[PDB]
Amino acid sequence: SVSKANVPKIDVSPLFGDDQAAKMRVAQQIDAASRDTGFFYAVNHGINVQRLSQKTKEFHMSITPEEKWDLAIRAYNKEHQDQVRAGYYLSIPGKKAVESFCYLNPNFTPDHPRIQAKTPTHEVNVWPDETKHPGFQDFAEQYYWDVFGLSSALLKGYALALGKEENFFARHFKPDDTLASVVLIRYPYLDPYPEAAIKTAADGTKLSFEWHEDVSLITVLYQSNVQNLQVETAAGYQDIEADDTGYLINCGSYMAHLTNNYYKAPIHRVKWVNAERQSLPFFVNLGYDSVIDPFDPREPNGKSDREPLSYGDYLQNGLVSLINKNGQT
Template structure:
């Protein structure tokens, strides 16, 4: 219960907390392999892997694939991949349900072992997140296994993003926030249940507080965790999704989030923690419908990442 109390304190405070002794022992390898991938990837490969927002030929890649840099406009680039269980025989793929896609990967001969490592990492991050949710459940006054029925390995919409922020001598124009801070990505809430982020070496995240935006430290061996918008919805904002932004730092760096999500049709009835008699303040909404709207809103607000 001590861990649950610490989660509760963090989520009702800044909204972020660090997780050590997490059992994921491949973070150094994750950083090395991802850095090498971005270094070796050619422009031709980027274009072939690009999501449909960039490459109109890739109509089946709305979420998964490569998010391109745009010369003179946008420097950040990333690869997003989804549930490795999604294949052409998956019932949600067969039914053409939105947000379900078969992952695309770079050529195995050019990037040997990359796909296998990343798929294994996906499940390691998924397992850690499921353990963290037990602490969240206890902190919210629920049974430790409360969340178990709402997300399964075979249908979770969870994703990994391998984000690269490059160092550039001639950096594209960056936005300046109202407080004068130069930012790479504007203020937002995550469209997840939980976000489990590995952000080593360079600190560039800031969280909104009553006193203004505050820097969040980086860590080479800990995960940074925060509740997402769906957690805020189902807890009637008892745990808010912290508003945060990416501060501009002209340095080569990686940001490697795992976004924990439910299944498309999963629906949790909103509740008021520690007050079971309180009526729900918000209507129940399936995770798929919540996520679709949240992603459209994010792109409209901050542009295509």
Template sequence: MPSASNPLVPTIDISPLFGDDKNAKLKVAGEIDQACRGSGFFLISNHGITVLDKLVETTKKFHQSMTDQEKFDLAIVAYNEKNSKQHRNGYYLPIKGKKAVESYCYLNPTFSSEHPMIKNSNTPLHEVNVWPDEKKHPGFREFNEDFYFKMFDMSAKLLRGFALALEKEEDFFDSYFKKEDTLSSVRLIRYPYLEDYPPVKTAADGTKVSFESHQDASLLTVLYQPYVANLQVSMPEGYCDIPSSDDCFLVNCGGYMAHITNNYYKAPIHRVKFVNAERLSLPFFVMLGYESKIEPFNHSKHDANAAEAPPAITYGNYFQNARVQLVITNGQT
């Protein structure tokens, strides 16, 4: 595991964000600020999530035990037109000879048929989760719903560090990031080892890539990716490797954070380097509510020649457009 002295991707102990020592919190905020103004990536330790081994075990078992028919029945509408209500939640299929990566995505467990954004208006981006058969995959739903809320709670604390880093009150994000309406999602992504791997793309610098250069469509991305390092971040000197960690989460800002901070915190451009190895990538995409709207602002450290802050847009409007651009750029994942 990389040490805190790693100049590209520092490790930040976020335990003070769970306490009451304001000076200790401000120290964490300063480290977050420095990391976001550097490569845009940092690892967080002492985050309070104690089920990472269980997460890996549950996810591996899920992917190994799902039949092709189960995957198709659970697939999003892009793969199974019968599932017309599943645009985000569901299975993202591998395609033989074309695409090896596969994943399952689930959304806010509070989204039910009675949720006001679904019952009254059928608002875009809100879906009632469709889960695999409980009899065939006992405990999978229960574990993942609990994991979702654990990640929400930890991310809420992390956002308090970001608020302080951005010279705001500690609770600045609280009214925008709420358990009952967050659009946050979890993706359980599997990259398999295959002897006959489908063709992969080659970047301009000659690197083979599984997912091309992009910025995340989120407020923050909090990623658990143990054992196999395959992410690269764009730096002035070229693409640089990002280390993996088996006990830390990797954090970076998404496009909405860049928007509201007028690019003081940029959404780093990164890509997934091709590695033919069995591995998991398990992101929690931190998102606000559909109607949340934060007025963009400048930081006191902004360059004196910084452009005027852009107009405010709702998170829902931002995310709908950002999702489309990701598919256009990299194809349906």
């Protein structure tokens, strides 16, 4: 058998309030989890995840092949040269099971200065027809702001955990410029399930997505109650138990960079499971020009031998590298 990963459930509700003592105790829990397996569940997070799941299901199960082409990213539809990130990511029956829809900051409007400049990683979201998907765009945009709010609170916890003032990360995480994304991923039940859509790890484990580190500062993830994720530890790969009432939180490689690897980006992978399920990450990305000066909370003077890296650089190149390593999703 595979052992269960330590993934503590942390009540993050104090991070929304003004009790500094209570916030420090939450920060300690985040520090402990970040130094151990690198995963925890945020509970008492205030988001209606059942409604998120229901609205997402309604979308995934009603969108048509025609709409998918019309919303497709550039990788699937050469007509859509502006859609590197945002849009529909198609399945390929017989070959690729997963499909998804990605959207970015709703404030990336046609008049936004980064959209006008055509700065990489900024795009105007594409949406299905309102009549075909009533309420979906409005729900999805509001969800962006709900999970943005949770993420801001979590970032206060991480900052305090690292010995910083609570706005150390959050001051770079702003509604007008965040590069954060939501992805609404459908992993289908299929009978028969295409073997071409299944990868095998060195240890024989059947996978839907190979080992990787996240391209994010942190990742704030809702999933169904179907166990699938594994994290690599010193004791080997361990199963992360599902909890469809919580958000699974981990650091990405930008956090590892900033902290000189004190908070590592945990290596994880996705087991193949023949089950209809949802994976709904929010990738907490900063602004394109955000630069956090790296430091080391294990060294007396906090100094680092890493160089500052702008977030936009990190993200554009990180997303391309992840596609190269683990395939176009």
